[PDB]
Amino acid sequence: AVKIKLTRLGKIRNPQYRIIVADARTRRDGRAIEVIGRYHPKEEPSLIQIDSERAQYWLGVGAQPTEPVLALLKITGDWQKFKGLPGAEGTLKVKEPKPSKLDLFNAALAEAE
Amino acid sequence: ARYTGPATRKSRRLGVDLVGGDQSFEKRPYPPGQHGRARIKESEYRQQLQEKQKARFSYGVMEKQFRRYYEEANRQPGKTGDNLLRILESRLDNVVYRAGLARTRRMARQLVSHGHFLVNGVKVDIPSYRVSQYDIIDVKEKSLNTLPFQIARETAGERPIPSWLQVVGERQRILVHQLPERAQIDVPLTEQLIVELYSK
Amino acid sequence: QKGPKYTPAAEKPRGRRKTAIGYVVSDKMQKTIVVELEDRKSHPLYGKIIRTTKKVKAHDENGEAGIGDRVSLMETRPLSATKRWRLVEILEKA
Amino acid sequence: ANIKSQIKRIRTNERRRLRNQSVKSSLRTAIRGFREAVDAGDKDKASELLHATSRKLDKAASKGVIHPNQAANKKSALALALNKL
RNA sequence: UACUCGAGUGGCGAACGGGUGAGUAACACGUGGGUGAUCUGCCCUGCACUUUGGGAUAAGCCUGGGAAACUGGGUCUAAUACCGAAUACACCCUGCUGGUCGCAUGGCCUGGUAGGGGAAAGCUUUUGCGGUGUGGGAUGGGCCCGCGGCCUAUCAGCUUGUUGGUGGGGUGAUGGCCUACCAAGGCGACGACGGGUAGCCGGCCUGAGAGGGUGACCGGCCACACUGGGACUGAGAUACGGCCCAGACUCC
């Protein structure tokens, strides 16, 4: 089937995966049809970007993901947004944005003087 | 592979104060050796060579890494010579030298080499780190009991601090506010001949 | 509750074949003619605009077309080997 | 020969081929008889054997032995030459 | 005893993946199209269903033959395997016919219509799995065309299944793809027919730029699997770790 997959990218230590929707007879880093999301596990809260509408489309036409992707879609609620069991419940931890460069250096200035 | 030879050597060769306290330079500005008195041929090439020679020997970097910085400089949208110089001045060790915590350019290189700084929560034993705007350079913990550096922080009356630096730290905490620009730098030979050489 | 057994298929735009417009040279076979089509390209190195020549063999079920004509043609599925086009209408007589 | 699944698959395909050779041979007998009927002009026997051959083609395609498009071209030729004779 | 499981039947996968670039100057590749000229297991989506009947055998057991590889017969057992029959009348063959869009054959209105046929399988005690035909999807592909990409007339004639047509056969489909027959036609100076070399491309290197060289890695196509052919099964096979045959080569 047209399985919704993760494909590897990057370098030897820190992988970064792209969420693709392609045929099962492809290879691990081969040709695709549509890159639709991604997933950066190497940091602990693990960035996840998922174009929801297009994933819903591909689940409608007759895709069939694998277990890890299904886990991600259930996290975000995309599977739950397709099946409506409780509702389309976002469990997604957007990462804690950090004190920016400007605020940092202004804090330095106002603290030191 | 860091340089190792005498600072006096290149100094007597090309004839510039770069170290500052070089009484052998004052005593013998002529080049050294058996034909140290002898006369040299002039050209465009010799001048354009001597330019980068002086610059990169002042700052420690090597020819090829200077060429990498050059590739970035003419990759910029600005103009090659002066933006190369801004790139080249953006180094960590040169910033702290102009802050004046260190006696020699070798000494600033050595300080940053041995990991004696502590930048925004990470040890940085990187003698070529690039410092953009708004970089809070704190110094590490054990920095206190370095004896010649105690004397340094106490009576640092050597070459002044330029405009684009400052210290707002009782712990000798040096900070960037703007970047260097050539109108205010006023350092030896300008990089137009360098541009013409590397784009020969 | 019982869904519809049937569902019509989406409206598909039946594609637009090309046409070519040439001068007939022969009907010395049966039900087919040879047409010397022409195209103005540019030489992709020296930029000059170039007239070229192209034989193309066509077909008519009723044998309307003679020699020394100006026709309209349309592409279609292969009628047979080295037959690929068809006549539309004898277009500017002579 | 070296994979055991392939060994099992060998003997399996041998069985299958045998079956399908017999199927096709039977169908070929049917059409040969029909053509001979048409060719001698037993229009009665033409239909009386066409019915047989047609059911035979239908259940040939139904077993997936041959494709319904093929079976349809066959039946079409039969029906047309019966209409002409 | 079945948690389980040697071997066996039965499915399913094995055609993907992985490698090489000898051949190939070819719609093989790249781009842009066409299909009223086509197939699609699997995944999903819908609709209607899933009835009945039957034989035999592998294994196992007995035994023979051969050095082994392996084969033979007698006996016996089972099914989602094989074989029947009955429905479907959504599908398919043909006849008559209304409308409609066309780009010609034609396509469409599950068009109507006299009429002929075609399906299937049961296990399960636990998130429960299935099976049949049928329409609509999505994915994969097969076919054709335009166009672009080396050297060489110290390679000028080439062509007889070649060129068009008729009737048939053939494939999933158009088609000299094959068949008997009718005409003699076709290709070529814009380089046929030949020879030499060579996998193609996104790309890589250089260059101010054009352009030239070039096809490491990675990604996508093509072709190949000791040499040369062929077919099978099957949704789908250059069927690398399948078959057959003829060689060559190594072993018993």
The beta strands (E) that lie in B24-173 are given as 117-119, 136-139
Q: Report the DSSP pairing between strands C24-26 and C54-59.
A: unpaired
- What DSSP string describes B10-36? HHHHH---SSS--HHHHH--S--STTT
Q: With H, G, I as helix, E, B as strand and everything else as coil, classify residue B106.
A: helix
**Nearest of A79, A99, A97, A98 to residue A89 by alpha carbon:** A79
Strand partners, C61: none
- For residue B95, count other CB atoms closer than 10 A to its CB: 23
List chain B residues with CB under 8 Å of A109. 168
Nucleotide with C1' nearest the A58 CA: E138
The beta strands (E) that lie in chain B are given as 117-119, 136-139, 174-175
- Which residues in window 2-31 of A are less than 7 A from strand E by Cβ? 2, 23-27, 29-31
Cβ-contact D85, D41 below 8 angstroms: yes
> What does residue A50 show for φ and ψ, rounded to 5 degrees?
-140, 115
Q: With H, G, I as helix, E, B as strand and everything else as coil, classify residue A53.
A: helix
Q: Cα separations (Å) of A55 from A63, A71, A82, A90?
A: 9, 14, 9, 15
Which residue matches tokens 């047609």?
D54
Q: What is the largest CA-CA distance in chain B?
A: 55
- Dist. CA B196–CA B192, nearest whole Å: 6
Q: Does B6 touch chain A (CB under 8 A)?
A: no
- Dist. CA B132–CA C30, nearest whole Å: 82
Residue of A nearest to B177 (CA): A105
Terminal-residue alpha carbon distance, chain A = 65
- Dist. CA B111–CA B137, nearest whole Å: 14
> Angle between the B63-75 and B80-89 helix axes, to the nearest 10 degrees?
120
- Dist. CA B162–CA B177, nearest whole Å: 12
- For residue A19, count other CB atoms closer than 10 A to its CB: 24
> What does residue A20 show for φ and ψ, rounded to 5 degrees?
-120, 160
- Dist. CA A110–CA A66, nearest whole Å: 53
Q: With H, G, I as helix, E, B as strand and everything else as coil, classify residue B71.
A: helix
Nucleotide with C1' nearest the D82 CA: E94
Q: Does B179 touch chain A (CB under 8 A)?
A: no
- Dist. CA B111–CA B93, nearest whole Å: 8
What is the experimental resolution, given in Å to one decimal place?
3.5
- For residue D3, count other CB atoms closer than 10 A to its CB: 8
Q: What is the largest CA-CA distance in chain A?
A: 65
- Dist. CA C12–CA B192, nearest whole Å: 65
Q: With H, G, I as helix, E, B as strand and everything else as coil, classify residue C29.
A: coil
Cβ-contact A64, A10 below 8 angstroms: no
Asked if strand E comes closer than 7 Å to C57 Cβ, the answer is yes
**Nearest of C85, C84, C58 to residue C69 by alpha carbon:** C58
The spacing between the Cα labelled CA in B154 and the C1' in E180, in angstroms, equals 115
- Dist. CA A98–CA B87, nearest whole Å: 27
Question: Which residues, 6+ apart, have CB-to-CB distance to B53 below 8 Å?
Answer: B10, B14
- B173 and A109 in contact by Cβ < 8 A? no
Cβ-contact B12, B29 below 8 angstroms: yes
> Angle between the D43-62 and D68-84 helix axes, to the nearest 10 degrees?
170
Instruction: Tell me the helix, strand and coil percentages in chain B, rounded to 5.
Output: 45, 5, 50
Q: With H, G, I as helix, E, B as strand and everything else as coil, classify residue A102.
A: helix
Asked if strand E comes closer than 7 Å to D77 Cβ, the answer is yes
The beta strands (E) that lie in chain C are given as 19-20, 24-26, 32-37, 40-42, 49-51, 54-59, 71-80, 83-90
- B134 and A112 in contact by Cβ < 8 A? no
The spacing between the Cα labelled CA in A68 and the C1' in E219, in angstroms, equals 25
- Dist. CA D16–CA D20, nearest whole Å: 6
Question: Which residues, 6+ apart, have CB-to-CB distance to C94 below 8 Å?
Answer: C68, C69, C70
Q: Is D22 exposed, middle or buried (0-12, 13-18, 19+ CB in 10 A)?
A: exposed
Named by the residue before each, gaps in chain B exceeding 2.5 A from C to N are none
Q: Report the DSSP pairing between strands A17-23 and A2-7.
A: antiparallel
Nucleotide with C1' nearest the D84 CA: E94
- For residue B133, count other CB atoms closer than 10 A to its CB: 12
Strand partners, B136: B175
> What type of residue is A8?
R
Asked if strand E comes closer than 7 Å to A64 Cβ, the answer is yes
> What does residue B145 show for φ and ψ, rounded to 5 degrees?
-90, 20
- Dist. CA B176–CA C79, nearest whole Å: 79
- Dist. CA B43–CA D84, nearest whole Å: 104
Q: Which two structure tokens, joined as six digits, stand for B49?
A: 């060579």
DSSP B123: B
- Dist. CA B68–CA D35, nearest whole Å: 86
Q: In what order do the strands lie in the sheet with A17-23?
A: A2-7, A17-23, A34-40, A47-50
- B175 and A105 in contact by Cβ < 8 A? yes
Terminal-residue alpha carbon distance, chain D = 54
Q: Does A104 touch chain B (CB under 8 A)?
A: yes
Q: With H, G, I as helix, E, B as strand and everything else as coil, classify residue A2.
A: strand
> What type of residue is B123?
K
Which residue matches tokens 């009907």?
C27
Torsion (CA) B148, B154, B158, B161 in degrees, nearest 10: 120
> What does residue A4 show for φ and ψ, rounded to 5 degrees?
-90, 115
Q: Report the DSSP pairing between strands B136-139 and B117-119.
A: antiparallel
**Chain B residues 121-160 with CB within 8 Å of chain A:** 133-136
Q: What is the largest CA-CA distance in chain C?
A: 72
- Dist. CA B161–CA B137, nearest whole Å: 16
**Nearest of C84, C79, C71, C91 to residue C17 by alpha carbon:** C84
Picking from B133, B134, B168, the nearest residue to A112 by CB comes out as B168
Q: With H, G, I as helix, E, B as strand and everything else as coil, classify residue B109.
A: helix
- Dist. CA B176–CA B162, nearest whole Å: 11
Size of interface A-B (CB pairs under 8 A): 17
Named by the residue before each, gaps in chain C exceeding 2.5 A from C to N are none
- Dist. CA B20–CA B27, nearest whole Å: 13
Picking from A101, A102, A108, the nearest residue to B175 by CB comes out as A108
- Dist. CA C65–CA C92, nearest whole Å: 11
Q: Cα separations (Å) of A68 from A6, A22, A23, D80?
A: 9, 16, 17, 59
Q: Which two structure tokens, joined as six digits, stand for C73?
A: 């043609």
> Angle between the B7-14 and B44-59 helix axes, to the nearest 10 degrees?
150
Q: Is D45 exposed, middle or buried (0-12, 13-18, 19+ CB in 10 A)?
A: middle
Torsion (CA) C78, C79, C81, C86 in degrees, nearest 10: -80
Cβ-contact C70, C93 below 8 angstroms: yes
Q: Where are the alpha helices (DSSP H) in chain D?
A: 4-40, 43-62, 68-84
